[model samples]
Target: RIHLVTWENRKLYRKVLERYFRIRYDIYVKQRRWRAVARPINIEIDAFDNEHALYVLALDGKIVGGSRLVPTLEPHLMSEVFPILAGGTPPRAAEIFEWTRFFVMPSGASSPVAGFVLCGLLETAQSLGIRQISVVCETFWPKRLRALGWTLFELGNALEHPDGDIIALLIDVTPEAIEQTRRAYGISGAILADG
Candidate 1:
């Protein structure tokens, strides 16, 4: 199940949220070697956690995949510290969300949960009246996601880092595009919920 974890339910889903933070620690901090992660603490958290919305994929009642969404009206990491990642103005608008902090449980590395979570991200975003999502990821994302029926336009080239080419691209989360991914992933019928 994919959960729409917003402030309304943040307290209600505290256990899953805790597990998701540890997963983020393993993936981004220990595995990916992100220096920004507060080290020796074994948890991944930033100021954004206070306000950002979350989409978490739980299989068998354990969180297996997730992503973070931040409204552009606030202080977002990309706009504050990584402008070079976009090589231009990072997207900012009321309806555009900053998409980041993606992670999947190592146990599910070979599972389809990653794609499923992404589909939920889009579906949930579309349902909320969001038009687009902004992200800085490996350059391949533009090519790969576009092939899956998303519209991605380059905001800049890839970053020269060991974590792969961190290119900035904006994603169109239209209903048509969300359905395209659902068909590609063979998932259906409200995989996500309001809570």
Candidate 2:
């Protein structure tokens, strides 16, 4: 099962959370070349990993994958860094969130842990009464999210970057989307461990 680690309970999962940071360093810095956020200690943490941040982490004896979420009402990635990509004013509300820092280690996209982490995102959103999530992702993500039955709306035109085409999006959280994600990923059980 995947674990949701928030600042409130971080101490309880200190070791696993530390490992999650290491995996994030490997994926974002060493692998993806995000030198702007790199640190000498080899843990990829930034301003967004604040008290308002939420994490959904997958574990197979160790942290394998994870995603980050932050309430849109605050100064998240979309509001602070990529506001121009938003095309219009980005959403900021109690029921909206920003999704970022998604990664799967070693196994990459083929890992079952990816499925678990996705489901964890959906489940965690639903549990907290979140109706929408803003995202800044690669252009290709819309196609994959559509295939997984997640309803997405583009918020801006694709912006060219060194990595690839990046665009802002709004994801509609729905029961069907969660169900379809599970169906497409072959997950028939609960993804959350603490729910």
Candidate 2, residue 76: the lDDT equals 89
Model 2 segments more than 4 A misplaced: 108-110
Task: Give the alpha carbon lDDT tens digit for every residue of 1-195 in model 1.
Answer: 677888877888788877777777777777655555665778877778785665555555787777888887777777886787677578889899888877667787557787778887887788788899988777767777987799877787677866555777888888878778888777766677654
lDDT of 1 at 182: 80
- Candidate number of the best TM-score: 2
Model 1 alpha-carbon drift over 4 Å, by segment: none
Clashes of each: 0, 0
TM-score, structure 2 vs. true: 0.93
Scored by lDDT, the top model is 2
Q: lDDT per residue, candidate 2, 43-112, as tens digits? A: 8888888889998888766777778899998898889888988865898999999999887776755767
For model 2 the local lDDT of residue 143 reads: 98
